[PDB]
């Protein structure tokens, strides 16, 4: 009477924070491979766990804008060999670094069109002898020797062209699809830092140059380590980058100068999973964004389906914080490297189609590890079921990503996400792609607005009484970590200067008046300063 199975055909098990797989073959997704068999119009719920394994190896490819404007931001780029290594050592045992540089399409409008034929060696109509422009050159493959890196990186100098925008998206692309040349280890955490001075050429810009052929997302970087199709093919679009960026499991970091930050921030909102890091003090590198970035990059776990047959729809429930279980979601944020999570998928056909393997993956973005699922199916004038809106017949059979009787409800939760990335500003639930605020006196599209909500000195208070005192509700819930990140720090009996922040005051259960201060510098850095030594009743 209908055998609908889902036998788990594979089961390596999550390695316990084992960065190095000494014959242990590191895995971060537990069910490695299940096998569905489906009755027509049937579902079978299953699960998958994913772990941000500790000491995971990292590769770091540096794409550097070597056009005449970066001139002021160089040399101390010795840092890279040294500065990446050190500040990353505390996170990995194996770190390979590599780098390449770019300028722009050595052509028609961009390039220093031969004015004096004596100028195929630029900025001579001023004099500094900056060598010819190139497009994208791969100088050093990802290796172990940081000293060998420390040097070849000092040999590099500024070239020069005429356009403010510099392309380089062309580089981001080749850096991604030329895995052989770049040496991307399919087992390590892949990073791509993009350091630039200003604007950039996007796709279509190359029509001026007379280039009308779309970027094929192919690798065109041979022996001479130069992007050959540079002059014969347009800049890549946000989509193709996005796609290739996610396929080759690579993370784009935007280490750019202040003047042009918000631009790459806005650009990152479109290549989701991309982070922006400021690179300004003097200029050659600052505060190792990489570290804080890689940290940030690995803060969330998001499941991404690949190759799913039209007929079966997948629904999710993601238990992120200690068996809390958040329905209709497939991503957990706030994670620190090492934490483990689990989502319960539930595949389901709608009248089984025709046989074949129809395998497909489900994997966390950024990782090689994936749960592959082989599917199989056991099937061997005026219809009033409607009212419209994706409602099929017999009696309403909503398509994928559509629930509800009428089929008007969505499974989408993307439109419910805030500026900070928390579902409904953490004050309401997503309901059919729309928040319905669990009203502590709030409203707004994603329940972001709440002018009558109590002073911040009430939200943070629970943190200090937890992190610095071990004794409040947030502790009493075991949720005083992923839920109360921030960054507390016992200030030296005296209160700070930055007069663009607030300073709080309260009485703990011990009847003493504790005094703190919430602050936010540049990476939006949340930082509290607790007056070491609270005023207590004397006697």
């Amino acid at each position: 009477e209908f055998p609908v199975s889902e036998a788990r055909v594979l089961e390596d098990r999550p390695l316990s924070d084992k960065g190095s797989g000494d014959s242990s073959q590191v895995t971060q997704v537990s069910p490695q491979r299940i096998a569905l068999r489906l009755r027509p119009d049937d579902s079978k719920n299953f699960s998958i766990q994913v772990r941000q394994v500790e000491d995971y190896p990292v590769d770091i490819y540096y794409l550097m804008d070597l056009s005449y404007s970066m001139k002021d931001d160089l040399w101390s780029i010795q840092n890279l060999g040294t500065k990446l290594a050190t500040q990353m050592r505390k996170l990995t045992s194996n770190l390979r670094i590599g780098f390449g540089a770019f300028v722009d399409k050595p052509v028609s409008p961009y390039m220093y069109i031969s004015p004096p034929e004596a100028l195929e060696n630029p900025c001579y109509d001023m004099k500094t002898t900056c060598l010819p422009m190139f497009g994208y050159k791969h100088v050093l493959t990802l290796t172990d020797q940081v000293t060998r890196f420390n040097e070849e990186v000092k040999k590099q100098s500024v070239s020069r062209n005429r356009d403010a925008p510099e392309g380089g998206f062309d580089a981001i692309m080749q850096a991604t699809v030329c895995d052989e040349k770049i040496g991307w280890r399919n087992d390590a955490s892949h990073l791509l830092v993009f350091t630039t001075d200003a604007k950039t050429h996007i796709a279509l810009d190359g029509r001026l140059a007379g280039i009308v052929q779309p970027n094929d997302g192919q690798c065109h970087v041979g022996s001479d380590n130069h992007y050959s199709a540079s002059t014969t093919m347009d800049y890549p679009s946000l989509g193709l980058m996005t796609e290739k960026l996610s396929q080759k499991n690579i993370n784009l970091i935007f280490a750019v100068t202040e003047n042009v930050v918000n631009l790459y921030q806005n650009y990152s909102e479109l290549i989701p999973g991309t982070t922006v890091g400021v690179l300004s003090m003097d200029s050659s590198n600052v505060l190792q964004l990489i570290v804080d970035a890689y940290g940030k990059i690995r803060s969330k776990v998001e499941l991404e389906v690949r190759d799913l047959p039209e007929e079966l729809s997948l629904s999710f429930n993601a238990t992120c914080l200690n068996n809390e279980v958040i329905p209709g979601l497939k991503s957990c944020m706030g994670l620190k490297i090492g934490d483990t999570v689990s989502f319960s998928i539930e595949a389901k056909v709608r009248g089984c189609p025709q046989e074949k393997e129809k395998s497909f993956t489900i994997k966390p973005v950024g990782f090689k590890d994936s749960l592959i699922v082989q599917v199989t199916f056991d099937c061997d004038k005026g219809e009033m079921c409607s009212g419209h809106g994706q409602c099929s017949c017999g009696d309403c059979l909503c398509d994928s990503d559509w629930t509800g009787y009428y089929c008007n409800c969505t499974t989408r939760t993307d439109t419910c996400m805030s500026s900070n990335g928390l579902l409904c500003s953490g004050r309401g639930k997503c309901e059919c792609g729309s928040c319905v605020c669990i009203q502590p006196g709030s409203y707004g599209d994603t329940c972001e607005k709440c002018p009558t909500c109590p002073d911040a000195c009430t939200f943070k208070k629970e943190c200090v009484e937890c992190k610095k005192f071990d004794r409040e509700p947030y502790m009493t819930e075991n949720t005083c970590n992923r839920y109360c990140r921030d960054e507390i720090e016992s200030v030296k009996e005296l209160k700070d200067t930055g007069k663009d922040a607030v300073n709080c005051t309260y009485k703990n259960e011990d009847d003493c008046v504790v005094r703190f201060q919430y602050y936010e510098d540049s990476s939006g850095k949340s930082i509290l300063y607790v007056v070491e030594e609270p005023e207590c009743p004397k006697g």
Binding site: S67, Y68, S69, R160, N161, R162, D163, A164, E166
Partner: peptide
């Protein structure tokens, strides 16, 4: 202006 001011 351009690849400079």
């Amino acid at each position: 202006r351009g690849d400079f001011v």
